[PDB]
A paper describes a structure:
In order to investigate the extent to which the structural features proposed to be necessary for oxygen sensing are conserved between HsPHD2 and TaPHD, we attempted to obtain a crystal structure of TaPHD in complex with Mn(II), a non-reactive substitute for Fe(II), using a TaPHD construct (aa 64-300, TaPHD64-300, MW=29.2 kDa) lacking the N-terminal MYND domain, which could be produced efficiently in Escherichia coli. The shorter construct (TaPHD64-300) yielded crystals that diffracted to 1.2 Å resolution. The substrate-bound and unbound forms of TaPHD crystallized in the P1 and P21 space groups, respectively, reflecting different packing, possibly relating to structural changes in TaPHD induced upon substrate binding. In the TaPHD.Mn structure without TaODD, the manganese ion is octahedrally coordinated by a conserved triad of residues (H209TaPHD, D211TaPHD, and H270TaPHD), an acetate ion, and two water molecules. Deep within the 2OG binding pocket an additional acetate ion forms a salt bridge with R279TaPHD, apparently mimicking 2OG C5 carboxylate binding. TaODD structures manifest in the mobile “β2/β3-finger-loop”,32–34 which is disordered in the substrate-unbound TaPHD structure (missing residues Q137TaPHD-R146TaPHD). By contrast, the β7(VI)/β8(V)-loop residue N245TaPHD is not observed in the TaPHD.TaODD structure, unlike in the substrate-unbound TaPHD.Mn structure, in which the electron density of the complete β7(VI)/β8(V)-loop is apparent.
Prolyl-4-hydroxylation of the oxygen dependent degradation domains (ODDs) in HIFα is catalyzed by the HIF prolyl hydroxylases (PHDs or EGLNs), and signals for HIFα degradation via the ubiquitin proteasome system. We have found that there is a functional HIFα-PHD-pVHL triad in the simplest animal, T. adhaerens. The structure of TaPHD contains the conserved double-stranded β-helix core-fold (DSBH, or “jelly roll”-motif), which is present in all characterized 2OG dependent oxygenases, including the human PHDs.
Author numbering: 73 to 75, 78 to 136, 147 to 295
The structure:
């Protein structure tokens, strides 16, 4: 994994396809899935670093059954997490100006999360119900060979809070983006194996000022 500075022309063109897809799918449907976002070698390095963090005891309790650690990217042993964040930042930067009226110039740290099996999940909720500044939620999933029929842990998304449910498996190297506000209630269904993911929330500068 070459942890983005000197990408090839073919990679730039792929990256433009990705951002155009994100813009069109967020604006049209309120969410967007990208399969195989980083590739297996780089995704494996992200997962290895997440497990090392988890084994070191730095996670803390996150209604919700997750354990979390906030990673800015400059921590020892987190260079692959930093690389992930740089890739998502570049993706969002290519979309800014095209995502609603939002002015996206910043984000949270990476929220590394584990639902440690045991039937744990997160009930239906809205990430940003109260104008807290967060406009786009980004999930990066890290679970190899995950069969949700056995492992549970699907994300159930309710676009536009209507009757339709979208059931999303938390599969390795999958990126998911969705509007953080009341347009996208969602729930993490109970997990029966250790379930790992990283979340980044991107801010709308004008709303984030409020808090
Ligand atoms: Mn959520």
């Amino acid at each position: 994994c070459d942890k983005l500075a000197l990408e090839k022309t073919w990679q730039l063109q792929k990256n433009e396809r990705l951002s155009n897809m994100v813009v069109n799918q967020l604006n049209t449907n309120g969410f967007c899935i990208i399969n195989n976002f980083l590739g297996s070698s780089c995704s494996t390095e992200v997962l290895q670093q997440v497990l090392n963090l988890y084994q070191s005891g730095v996670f803390s309790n996150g209604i919700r059954g997750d354990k979390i650690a906030w990673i800015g990217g400059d921590e020892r042993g987190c260079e692959a997490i930093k690389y992930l964040s740089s890739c998502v930042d570049s993706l969002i930067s290519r979309c800014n100006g095209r995502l609603g009226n939002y002015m996206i110039t910043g984000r949270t740290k990476c929220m590394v999360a584990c639902y440690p099996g045991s039937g744990l999940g997160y009930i239906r909720h809205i990430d940003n119900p109260n104008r807290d500044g967060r406009c786009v939620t980004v999930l990066y999933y890290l679970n190899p060979n995950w069969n949700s029929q056995d492992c549970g842990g699907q994300l159930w998304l309710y676009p536009n809070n209507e009757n339709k449910v979208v059931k999303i498996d938390p599969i390795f190297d999958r990126l998911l983006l969705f509007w953080s506000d009341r347009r996208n209630p969602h729930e993490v269904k109970p997990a029966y194996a250790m379930r790992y993911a990283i979340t980044l929330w991107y801010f709308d500068e004008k709303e984030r000022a409020l808090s």
